[PDB]
Design a protein around this ligand. Structure first.
Ligand SMILES: *[C@@H]1O[C@H](CO)[C@@H](O[C@@H]2O[C@H](CO)[C@@H](O)[C@H](O)[C@H]2NC(C)=O)[C@H](O)[C@H]1NC(C)=O
Ligand SMILES: *[C@@H]1O[C@H](CO)[C@@H](O[C@@H]2O[C@H](CO)[C@@H](O)[C@H](O)[C@H]2NC(C)=O)[C@H](O)[C@H]1NC(C)=O
Ligand SMILES: O=P(O)(O)OC[C@H]1O[C@@H](n2cnc3c2N=CNC[C@H]3O)C[C@@H]1O
Ligand SMILES: O=P(O)(O)OC[C@H]1O[C@@H](n2cnc3c2N=CNC[C@H]3O)C[C@@H]1O
Ligand SMILES: *[C@@H]1O[C@H](CO)[C@@H](O)[C@H](O)[C@H]1NC(C)=O
Ligand SMILES: *[C@@H]1O[C@H](CO)[C@@H](O)[C@H](O)[C@H]1NC(C)=O
Ligand SMILES: *[C@@H]1O[C@H](CO)[C@@H](O)[C@H](O)[C@H]1NC(C)=O
Ligand SMILES: *[C@@H]1O[C@H](CO)[C@@H](O)[C@H](O)[C@H]1NC(C)=O
Ligand SMILES: *[C@@H]1O[C@H](CO)[C@@H](O)[C@H](O)[C@H]1NC(C)=O
Ligand SMILES: *[C@@H]1O[C@H](CO)[C@@H](O)[C@H](O)[C@H]1NC(C)=O
Ligand SMILES: [Zn+2]
Ligand SMILES: [Zn+2]
Lengths: 497, 497
């Protein structure tokens, strides 16, 4: 079969070429400028991989984000991805998507903010305009007083940040198991819950999400939000439709201010710890908001730790209720599903129910590669999998990110969008850190700008924009992309090759 | 309405899940009534341990480092059942790493003319010298007999030898916390034993111990990688590879004539992939000759040693294609270690492409295979079994939580797989039971039971290199062992009725 080296080379290159064509982005044809940028990216990628391989040292893009963040930021591939327009971030949580630094430097400088140390020795924050809060399990102190008496305000503010962020130490070392790091993650939300549900802080925090995401060259976001319970200084507690209206008004003002930004849409989330009786009411609520806020309210999702809590099947009559009405109602679902290392259990079989329920996208889908028939349904229906790589590493599904279970999905061209999940919780950027690790760890050394470009286009093409909005957003994205290519050729001194 | 009732929903759900069950390894097996009684007990135990980890929020011990899991698994019913179970064959083993370090200590280092020294890295080394102490090149050699007699504690002395040689004295994931640190320790182990284990009578007896130990773990057949080379006598005489093969052939014949309940052994010549292509060319020609003159005992050729930093298959391609280019062609079988890596799109994982273009009979490890869909197709189409060595892949730095092992998605697609132990002597594993336990508990799901075990066992004979007559006989023998195991198991676990 191979009398000479040319025949062997031809067969080898046919097989390898077939796989390169099959994977995400493999059918893209780059133009001549894109090819110059691609050649540089591929030279850079090869040099870091070959150094790790042949000089026998760890591959930094795949280690704990705690260790790799400060390392990746100085490299050309990272700087290119930082400049690159991302399209959309489609998997985000609204209390976890702006900087803890803003909570500290802005929110905790507002009037009537209190702090206490809880019984686990973490700081909690809240607002009370009607006296200090009751000493229920902790002793509340006015932040303004504690800060002014600290003797070192910079250290005091840095201590707040350090006590709240999950990247203050390496979570893989400090919280070295799934349930320990989920204990720390849940705790983070408890620390901020009081302050971040105060209505004007909540409003301004959401506006900060939009500002930070635009600043990372993201033009569109879909965000999970609980919507409900925002409270005023006088103790007024608002309902979920108010919370939705609040976000709508902020988004409209943001898009008026920044016509280079496509905007935002919202998914109602509820934690999967509640009785089925209550989930039923949240489904009904979501049916009403979907009918009355078409094109801003998207649908429903169930969140919180997947392994120990209620499965989709545990809520199946609630989730089937819209489809069973006369006439039927198609309430879109965005289920977090298969965020687990388990196989053949109630947890990863959530992926089956997600498909039976016609999920528009799947959150995480870490277990999906263990399910060949679910993979085929995902591919044939075009159900995008929202892949959140830093989240899956820090929250205990994988250590070396080259073992991330989405790499084999991308190799088969399962539809995938990259997102950051909870970037504010662990000091990530809106998209650039997660896109970097996806690019360096979840695809191969010979995968270049075509993969980046496809993942960026995917985030618009599998968004929940209607077809007209998608066409408008792609025109804007194409203009950004063209500017990014020209700028990059100038910046990396590539124009003459 | 697609699902107006619970029955309509569960019908669809169960057909989908069942369709995946039929597709995975073992999915077409129909257990008889006795097998079903045992299977029901295995599945109750499996669910009990998984549900405890999941709902009581504690780590799943079958998936943690073997250093931690070994003593815990050994007291459990599922482990004890797998221990009693006939394994069929171990198809991926190295002949200097497949018997107990305890035997090296209690037997080999009690022989005349055995010397020890501490090397510059503070590790003990052992060798044989018939003339006097070896030249004190980078260490000071001392007669082991004298050192033992003067230790002041013989049992502590022997225990220290074992502790200084074993990779399971501490947890390698802690003590050597990177791929290249643990490969440094693994390489060191071979250097520690190399002198003593290449002395001819010790090497003969160590190979016999491999056979005895594997038989004792209810393994009836082995295929073994060996260098065959450099076996040396007390007077300094160094034997050629053909002598090493003839030596193993005689040990094997005596063993099978002693034990009709054991099917036997066959040998694969291995060469380390750090050598110049001229050396590999000589070993390829050697392998052609031994394949011709020892049919049915000499199987073919393999390249071993660390895959990432050393020479690729393509680096030796002129040598590896040489048999097929003879007139008339000569079809030298290959059993390449391939894709034992976390890299993607590099020279290392593309070894999988060359392994299939060179018509490999089986592939060793294939850890990267799930990232290569076109290679998967060829592996399935041609029946090229992947030798999966789960404890080895964890301890030697490819994966931490074995539920992330890259063979679980292969098994879910019914890629042909055999489980093996690789270097069980190096880290105190049993011949097969520990690896079979971690494969069963980590690489398939909670609802996968005795049918998966039975299929992996049968696979190890079906994808052995036995000829038609041998294989028919071995499968009849395996069936008999299996029936005895089922009957004994029902009595032992009080499952009758
Ligand atoms: C959050 O802040 C508290 C209060 O400063 C930290 O408590 C300190 O913890 C270290 C180590 O546990 C001790 O040396 C100090 O004495 C503790 N101080 C007090 C007042 O208890 C706590 O470690 C912080 N938690 C995190 C996760 O950063
Ligand atoms: C192999 O044995 C040597 C010699 O006993 C060990 O070196 C000792 O390491 C201990 C750690 O417990 C030190 O306290 C001693 O000082 C060391 N002794 C000497 C003479 O250096 C070495 O650690 C062992 N290596 C392994 C991998 O077990
Ligand atoms: O109720 P809130 O909106 O104030 O808190 C946010 C809610 O979202 C949950 N969540 C946030 N990031 C994730 C979540 N869940 C599951 N997978 C991991 C990750 O993707 C936590 C809390 O229940
Ligand atoms: O020279 P010897 O035969 O005495 O030592 C054995 C030779 O096999 C090598 N080896 C042993 N276990 C494996 C090996 N290689 C690659 N992957 C991991 C594992 O599967 C080490 C040495 O080169
Ligand atoms: C390994 O390191 C040396 C020295 O730092 C460097 O010169 C060399 O290029 C590196 N090798 C690779 C393949 O990067
Ligand atoms: C906080 O943000 C608000 C609204 O965006 C702004 O008015 C105010 O000045 C900020 N506070 C600080 C301390 O920057
Ligand atoms: C899912 O969508 C299909 C195709 O539109 C529709 O026929 C079916 O009724 C839907 N199923 C559910 C459970 O809502
Ligand atoms: C959790 O642990 C408790 C205490 O050992 C035990 O009673 C219970 O059965 C456990 N739950 C599961 C599902 O194993
Ligand atoms: C070592 O093994 C040989 C070969 O089986 C046996 O004859 C000899 O007695 C053994 N040595 C010891 C100390 O048992
Ligand atoms: C591989 O096997 C095929 C089919 O049996 C045969 O035609 C071909 O010559 C072989 N190629 C090599 C390189 O041995
Ligand atoms: Zn999420
Ligand atoms: Zn091996």
């Amino acid at each position: 079969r191979f009398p000479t080296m040319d025949e062997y080379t031809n067969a080898r290159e046919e097989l390898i070429g077939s796989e390169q064509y099959l994977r995400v982005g493999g059918s893209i044809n780059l133009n001549n400028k894109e090819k110059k940028l691609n050649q540089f990216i591929l030279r850079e990628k090869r040099a870091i991989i070959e150094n790790s391989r042949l000089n026998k040292t760890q591959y930094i893009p795949a280690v704990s984000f705690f260790l790799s963040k400060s390392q990746m930021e100085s490299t050309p591939i990272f700087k290119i991805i930082k400049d690159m327009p991302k399209g959309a971030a489609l998997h985000l949580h609204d209390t976890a998507s702006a900087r803890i630094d803003w909570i500290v430097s802005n929110a905790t400088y507002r009037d009537h903010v209190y702090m206490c140390m809880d019984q686990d020795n973490f700081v909690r924050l809240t607002v009370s305009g009607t006296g200090p809060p009751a000493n229920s399990g902790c002793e509340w102190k006015l932040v303004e007083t504690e800060r002014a008496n600290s003797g070192d305000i910079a250290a005091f503010d840095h201590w707040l940040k350090s006590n709240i962020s999950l990247l203050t130490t390496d979570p893989l070392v400090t919280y070295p198991s799934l349930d320990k790091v989920w204990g720390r993650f849940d705790k983070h939300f408890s620390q901020l819950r009081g302050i971040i549900y105060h209505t004007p802080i909540r409003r301004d925090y959401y506006r900060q999400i939009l500002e930070e995401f635009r600043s990372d060259n993201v033009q569109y976001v879909e965000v999970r939000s609980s919507l409900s319970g925002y409270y005023d200084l006088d103790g007024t507690v608002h309902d979920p439709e108010y919370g939705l209206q609040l976000y709508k008004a902020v988004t409209e003002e943001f898009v008026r201010t920044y016509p280079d930004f496509s905007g935002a849409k919202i998914i109602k989330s509820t934690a999967r710890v509640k009785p089925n009786t209550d989930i039923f009411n949240d489904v009904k609520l979501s049916m009403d908001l979907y009918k009355r806020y078409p094109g801003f309210f998207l649908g429903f999702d169930l969140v919180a730790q997947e392994d120990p809590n209620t499965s989709l099947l545990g809520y199946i009559d609630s989730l089937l209720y819209p489809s069973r009405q006369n006439p039927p109602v198609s309430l879109p679902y965005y289920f977090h599903a298969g965020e687990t290392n388990w196989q053949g259990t109630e947890v990863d079989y959530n992926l089956v129910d997600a498909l039976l329920l016609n999920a528009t996208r799947i959150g995480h889908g870490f277990a999906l590669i263990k399910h060949p028939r679910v993979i085929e349904l995902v591919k044939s229906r075009g159900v995008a999998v929202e892949v959140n790589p830093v989240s899956n590493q820090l929250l205990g599904l994988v250590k070396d990110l080259r073992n991330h279970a989405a790499a084999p999905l991308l190799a088969q061209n399962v539809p995938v969008v990259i997102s950051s999940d909870d970037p504010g919780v662990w000091e990530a950027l809106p998209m650039s850190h997660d896109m970097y690790v996806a690019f360096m760890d979840l695809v191969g050394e010979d995968a270049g700008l075509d993969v980046l470009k496809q993942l960026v286009w995917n985030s618009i093409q599998y968004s929940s924009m209607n077809a007209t909005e998608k066409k408008t957003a792609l025109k804007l994205l194409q203009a950004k992309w063209n500017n990014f290519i020209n700028d990059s050729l100038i910046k990396w001194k590539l124009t003459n090759k």
